[PDB]
């Protein structure tokens, strides 16, 4: 079972989050020593994490299980390592989450809000009925990225091009182009302020000595990996949300005859889903999750992906149910490292999916969908669609 099962062998997520390697898992050791492979990072064995309980305990334990332990076009070089938010511990991570929080106003939001509605429109109006094209190129990427800019206050002019170098032409040309694009956006405002999250945050001077503000190049760091994931992340809960209502059509008459149960709805497209279906931490002292006793200083993957599946807690844990309740997913996570966007991604499914579902209520999957080869994101390249009335 397990001895012959290589989580870090990323052919095993080429077609999807593999559940029933996750079913096997969970069954066979909650908690058990990956010894390193061929293909693992670093050729450090880690501690994996299967089962719901244990997932949860992990998360609300910074102290013991410790945040501090990129892929993409982000810079490989620079002079300094910089820390993100979710890569720290308090103290300094506190200070720089309150900060971010602090980022998300009223006003921003409200920017984000009406735009996604303009484009949600836009877009749908813009489907040929009945004739198929891919979702996520042509709808499900769009948004999550313009709400994505609006945030870190990028000019609409800007945005597109931008998006090739996050998601592209080489590495290095990339991570050049954003790194010259982000300082510049940065000096610009500090000269200027403006009502977005990027300057609130890169305005901020902390006092503390052991929590001190961003410095430039974590903030280009915070820009970038916000930017490419979180996006990213949005996307692929749109994509399978898609996907998942096109595969129970009752459910989709349901839903699209009856909007007050899309919240409901939205929190099981999140677990269904589960875009950021894994995490790392580090043992920070000698400590027993779930009676297999863990060392100080090593490694330990918590997976979202199948604690959101774990039977002990969603009864038909493998069935998709847009009226599911209870549901104490942990798609968000869990703790002080919550997501801080869990309410932007929820209101991109909300608007979509009301202007999405108004207009089609026949929805068909007419190629297989392609999924993005990681153990980091799961998601959906190409998912080709017909759209109709019905
Ligand atoms: C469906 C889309 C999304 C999913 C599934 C998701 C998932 C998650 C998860 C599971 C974590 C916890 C990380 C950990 O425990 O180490 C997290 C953290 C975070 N998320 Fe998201 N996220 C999504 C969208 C967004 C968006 C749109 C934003 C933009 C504000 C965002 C911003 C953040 C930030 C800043 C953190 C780190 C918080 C901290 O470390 O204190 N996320 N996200
Ligand atoms: C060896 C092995 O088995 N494996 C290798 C390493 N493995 C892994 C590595 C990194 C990782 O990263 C998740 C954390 C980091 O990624 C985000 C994604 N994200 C973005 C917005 N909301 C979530 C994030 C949040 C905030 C910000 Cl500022 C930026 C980001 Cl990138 O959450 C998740 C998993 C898991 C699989």
Redesign the pocket.
């Known amino acids: 079972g397990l001895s012959g099962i290589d989580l870090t062998d990323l052919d095993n997520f080429a077609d999807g989050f593999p559940h029933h390697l996750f079913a096997i898992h969970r069954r066979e050791a909650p908690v058990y020593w990956h010894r390193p492979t061929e293909h693992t990072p670093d050729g450090e064995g880690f501690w994996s994490v299967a089962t719901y309980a244990e997932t949860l305990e992990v998360?609300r334990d910074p102290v013991t299980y410790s945040?501090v332990t990129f892929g993409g076009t982000v810079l490989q070089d620079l002079p300094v390592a910089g820390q993100v938010?979710?890569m720290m511990d308090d103290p300094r991570?506190t200070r720089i989450?309150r900060l971010?929080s602090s980022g998300l106003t009223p006003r921003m939001i409200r920017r984000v809000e009406d735009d996604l509605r303009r484009r949600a429109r836009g877009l749908l109006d813009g489907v040929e009925p009945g004739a198929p094209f891919d979702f996520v190129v042509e709808i499900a990427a769009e948004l999550p990225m313009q709400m994505?800019c609006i945030?870190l206050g990028v000019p609409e002019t800007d945005r597109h091009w931008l998006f090739e170098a996050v998601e592209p032409l080489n590495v290095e040309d990339a991570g050049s182009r954003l790194y010259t694009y982000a300082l510049e956006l940065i000096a610009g405002k500090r000269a200027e302020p403006a009502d977005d999250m990027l300057s609130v945050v890169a305005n901020a001077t902390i006092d503390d000595p052991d929590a001190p503000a961003l410095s430039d190049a974590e903030l280009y760091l915070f820009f970038h990996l916000?930017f490419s994931a979180?996006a990213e992340?949005?996307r692929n809960?749109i994509a399978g949300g898609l996907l998942a209502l096109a595969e129970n059509p009752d459910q989709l008459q349901t839903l699209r005859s009856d909007f007050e149960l899309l919240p409901t709805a939205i929190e099981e497209i999140?677990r269904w889903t589960s875009?950021?279906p894994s995490?790392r931490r580090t043992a920070s002292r000698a400590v027993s999750l779930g009676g297999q006793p863990i060392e100080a200083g090593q490694k330990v993957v918590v997976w979202?992906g199948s604690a959101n599946r774990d039977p002990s807690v969603f009864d038909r844990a493998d069935e998709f149910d847009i009226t599911r309740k209870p549901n104490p997913h942990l798609?968000?996570?869990q703790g002080?490292?919550?997501?801080?966007?869990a309410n932007?991604?929820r209101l991109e499914l909300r608007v979509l999916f009301e202007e999405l579902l108004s207009r089609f209520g026949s929805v068909r999957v007419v190629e297989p969908a392609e999924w993005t080869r990681s153990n980091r994101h799961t998601g959906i390249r190409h998912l080709v669609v017909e759209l109709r009335g019905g």
Not at 336 to 341: E, F, Q
């Open positions: 998360l945040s938010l979710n991570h989450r971010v994505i945030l916000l979180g992340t949005t809960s999140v875009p950021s995490k979202e798609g968000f996570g002080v490292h919550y997501c801080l966007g932007l991604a």
